[PDB]
Amino acid sequence: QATHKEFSQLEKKFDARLGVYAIDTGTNQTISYRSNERFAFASTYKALAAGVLLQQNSIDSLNEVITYTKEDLVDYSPVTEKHVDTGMKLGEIAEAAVRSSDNTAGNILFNKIGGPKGYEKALRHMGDRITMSDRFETELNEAIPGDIRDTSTAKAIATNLKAFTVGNALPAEKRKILTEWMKGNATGDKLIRAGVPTDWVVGDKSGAGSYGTRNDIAIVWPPNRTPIIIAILSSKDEKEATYDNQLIAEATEVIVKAL
Ligand SMILES: [Cl-]
Incomplete structure (x- = not known):
């Protein structure tokens, strides 16, 4: 509640809508701002879908070779586009989705957990009644305000x-x-990682979509402390709006000061 003025000032300085939720896992203290408003999750799902994949499959099963076609390659597939003829190990595909945000890898990850419907079913089973998953990459980035698909x-x-x-x-x-x-x-370098002190460590997953959607979610480790879980989401009124990584980094600085 104390941080609401700071976050609202960031919304004005960056002409954006900002959604924040952070929880200190050692104290249960939370920081929240618009934490119940919907945003398109964009590529942030790849970290959670990788979690679902790991929950449903053994470590050894990550060695299975998955194949795909040139036709399957959607926009921004820098890893998977190099391995059409040979396939890739399932674990390497999941890693490519999380590390590089490869969109075809994201779709293969979806495929292996039952598609968007399967991803949503897995989240419901963990008690998440909120997330709505409907589409594959790259249509899931459409982010129409008021449309709850992929939010x-x-x-x-x-x-x-x-x-x-x-x-x-x-x-x-x-x-x-x-x-x-x-x-x-590197996809995280300008986001939450840019907003934490230099002695903190960040594991994140970035996202970007239409309507200026720009997101980052992370587990962050301060020195000598329990981890903090952060989700920062942002979007704008206009379909073709730009985004500014600095908004996420600045929002992170507010969280760090509060926690
Ligand atoms: Cl809210």
Whole structure:
């Protein structure tokens, strides 16, 4: 509640709508701003869908070779486009989705958990009544305001990310695989990672979509402290609106100061 003025000032400085939910897993203190408003989740689902994949499949089964065609390649598939003729190991596809945001890898991940419907079913089983998953990449980025397809809230997303990365949604060995996939990726450098102090460590998953949608979700580790789970979502009124990574980094600075 104390941070509401700071977040509203960021909305004005960046002409955007901002959704924030952060929870300190050691104290249960939360920071929330518009945390119940819907945004298109865009590529942030890839971290959670990787969690669902790990929950439903053994570590050894990540060695299965999955194949696809040139026709299957959707926009922004920098890893999968290099391996059409040979296929890739399932674990490498999941890693490509989380690390590089490869969209064809995201669709294969969807396929392996039952499509958008299967992803939604898995989240409902974890107690998430909010997230709505309907479409594959790249149509899921359409982000029409008022259209609930492929949307969630900062609170719902953060709660799911907490379950997978710190909670009891996964066994410890798979939790480690997921958090490692989330660490050290360039797609996160200008977002939450840019807004935390230099002695903090961030494992994140970024997202971007239409209507200026720009998101980042993360598990962050301060020094000598329990992790903090952060979801920052943002969007704008106009379909062709730009986004500004600095909004997410600035929102992160407010969270850091409060926590
Ligand atoms: Cl709200």
